[PDB]
Amino acid sequence: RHCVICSNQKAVIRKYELNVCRQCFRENAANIGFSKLR
Amino acid sequence: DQAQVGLIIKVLGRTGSRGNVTQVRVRLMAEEGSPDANRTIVRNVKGPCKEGDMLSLMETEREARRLR
Amino acid sequence: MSAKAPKLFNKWSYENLQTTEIALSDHISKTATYVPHSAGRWQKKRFRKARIPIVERLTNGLMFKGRGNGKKLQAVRLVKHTLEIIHLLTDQNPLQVVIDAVSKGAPREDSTRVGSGGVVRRQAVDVSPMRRVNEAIYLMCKGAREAAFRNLKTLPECLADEIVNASKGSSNSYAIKKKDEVERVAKANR
Amino acid sequence: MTTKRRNHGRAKPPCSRGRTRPVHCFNCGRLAPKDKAVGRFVVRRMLDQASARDVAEASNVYGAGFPMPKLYMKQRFCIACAIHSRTVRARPTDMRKRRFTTKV
RNA sequence: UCCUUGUUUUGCGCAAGGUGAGAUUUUGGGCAACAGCAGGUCUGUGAUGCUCCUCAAUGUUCUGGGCGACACGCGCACUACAA
RNA sequence: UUGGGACCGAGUAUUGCAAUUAUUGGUCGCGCAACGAGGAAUGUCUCGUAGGCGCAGCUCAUCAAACUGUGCCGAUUACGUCC
C-alpha cells in the first residue's frame, strides 16, 4: 500500500488495527497509550 | 548367576566425576550367620541409589576403587 | 459392590502375582487400576517414579517416533491384545509374566569408561535397582518397533513373543543378549 | 635478580657450606642437593583396613597376635616432582615464610 | 509457618514429611547497574556533519516494461515432505 | 506400492490498475521420478516440558513450507558433576 506519516512506502507499513507507526517506529514514536509490562 | 542381596547401609560418598556413577557401600544381609570377615564391601553403582535399597551382587570381595 | 475392594485389569487378578526377585521390590509394584493410562504427574522428585507399577512405566515408554502417532490411548489398545496372547501362551496370568521378564532381561552388572591418561579403564559396576527396571523396559520395547519396522506381519504379537522369551531366559529376546554380553566383559574384567 | 627466598629454597644457611651432597629421586631419578630436596616420611600400610580383617581371621599368631608391621621409608623428592603430585603447593606471601619444622 | 524434636557448636540455614490449591527467588514473564565494542543502522524520520547527484535530473514521476526470483545440476544456512 | 510427491501437458473459474502456470480452495495426466530412517559431524530441552497436531492473527490486487499468539494429545531419562 502506501503510508501517510512518511511517503517512503518501504521500510514496512503497518496497517494493523487502522494505524501506521512502523514507517516511524513506535519505540521512538510512542504516546499512543501502549505499554509493555509483560 | 549369583544373586546375593545386600542392603545399602549408607551413602559412602561421591566418587567418579561423570555425574553418572557413585561409589556406595553394601552390607551383606545375604548371610544367615555364615562367616564373613569382608564384611561390608564397597561397590561402584550405576545410576541413582538410596539407603535401604536391596540389590543383587554378581561378585563379592570387591574393594571398588583400588589404586587404579 | 464387587468393584469396591476387588481390583482387576478387567479379568486379570493381582492376588496371583508375587515379586519374582528380592533385589527388586520397591521398584516393582503391583497394579490395581483397570487401564495403565496415565493422567497424573509422574515425576517431580528423584524417587517418585517407583511409587507406581512396571505396567504403567512400560506402556508409556512403549513407542515414540511421532508423526501423528496416537500416544497413550493407542498404546493401551495394543496392551489389551498382548495380555490375551501372553495368557494363552504361558497358560498363566499375563501380568505375572511381565513381572518376571522385566527382572530377567535386565543387566545386573555393567562396566563403564572412567579411566584417564589418554586411555579408558573399565571396572565392574553394579546396576542399581531402578536402573535394572528402566533399562530392561526400554530394550524390550525397542525390539518391538524394530521387528515391525519393515518386517513380520505382526502388530502387537512381537511384544508378547519378547516378554515370553525374556521370562524364559531364552536368547531370542532383545533384552537377554544385552545382559549376557555386558556381563561377559564385566565379570571377565575388574 | 630479586631475592624471592631468603634461604634460597634451602635449609643451607649462607657462609657455611656452599656444597651439600646430591641425592637421587624416587620418581624420575633427578639429582638435587640434600637441603633443597623435599623430605617426607611415609609410614605405608602393608594391608588396607578392608583386607586387614580378612587376613586377621585366618591368622592366629599374627594380626591379633602381634600388631602388623609397616613399611617405613624416607622419600626425598625433587621440586617439580613434589608440585606435580600436589603434596607441596604454592602459597600466598604471608604463608610462604611459615615453617612447621621437621614435625608433621 | 509448623513438625520431624533429624541436620542446626549459638547464628545464617539445610533435608524429609505435614497442613494445604500451591513448597520456594510461590510459579511463568517483563524491567535492570557500571564499564564498554571503532558491533549494526546515514534505504525509519522534518535526527544530522560534508559533498556527491541538481535539469539529454541520474533528483522526481498512480508513466510504460524489466530486475532483485537467472540455473554448469555448484557449496553453505534455514524450512518443509517422506521412506 | 495401493507408501510418497516433484516434474510435465491439456481445460476452466476466481482476484486485480496491470499477469507473462501471479491466481490455485480445481478438475486429471505423468508416479513403474526421488527417498527405505540414511558416513564423518552437530543441534536443544529435566514437566504439562520435549515430541506430535491444528487454528487464528501478521504481511495485503492476490499467495505462508515464514513469523507471532491461543488450544488439543502428551512421555522416556536425570534431579548429578564439572571432566
Count the alpha carbons within 13 Å of C84 in the hemisphere toward its beta carbon: 9
Count the alpha carbons within 13 Å of C44 in the hemisphere toward its beta carbon: 2
Superfamily of domain C1-190 in the CATH hierarchy: Ribosomal protein S7/S5 (1.10.455.10)
Task: Tell me the residue range of the domain where D95 lies.
Answer: 1-104
**In chain D, how many H helices and how many E strands?**
3, 4
B chain contacts of residue D54, beta-carbon cutoff 8 Å: 37-38
Q: Which nt has its C1' nearest the CA of B49?
A: F80
Domain count across chain B: 1
Chains B and D touch (3+ CB pairs under 8 A): yes
- Which residues have a Cβ under 8 Å from the Cβ of A37 and sit 6 or more positions away? none
H-run or E-run covering A24: none
Closest C-alpha to D54, from B61, B15, C170: B61
Domain layout of chain C by residue ranges: 1-190
> Which amino acid would we find at residue C128?
S
Q: Which CATH number does the domain housing residue B3 bear?
A: 2.40.50.140
Mutate to test the interface with B, among D49, D57, D59 (most CBs of B within 10 A): D57
Closest C-alpha to C121, from C185, C183, C180: C185
DSSP-H helix ranges across C91-175: 94-104, 129-147, 157-168
**Residues 104-143 of chain C sitting with CB below 7 angstroms of strand F:** 130-131, 133-134, 137-138
CB contact under 8 A, B58 and C190: no
Buried b / exposed e along D77-100 (16+ C-beta atoms within 10 A): bbeebbeeeeeeeeeeeeeeeeee
- Which residues have a Cβ under 8 Å from the Cβ of C96 and sit 6 or more positions away? C16, C17, C18
Task: Write down the experimental method used for this entry.
Answer: cryo-EM
Domain count across chain D: 1
C chain contacts of residue B44, beta-carbon cutoff 8 Å: 123-126
Q: Which CATH number does the domain housing residue D3 bear?
A: 3.30.1740.20
Say yes or no: Cβ of A38 under 7 A from any atom of strand F. Answer: no
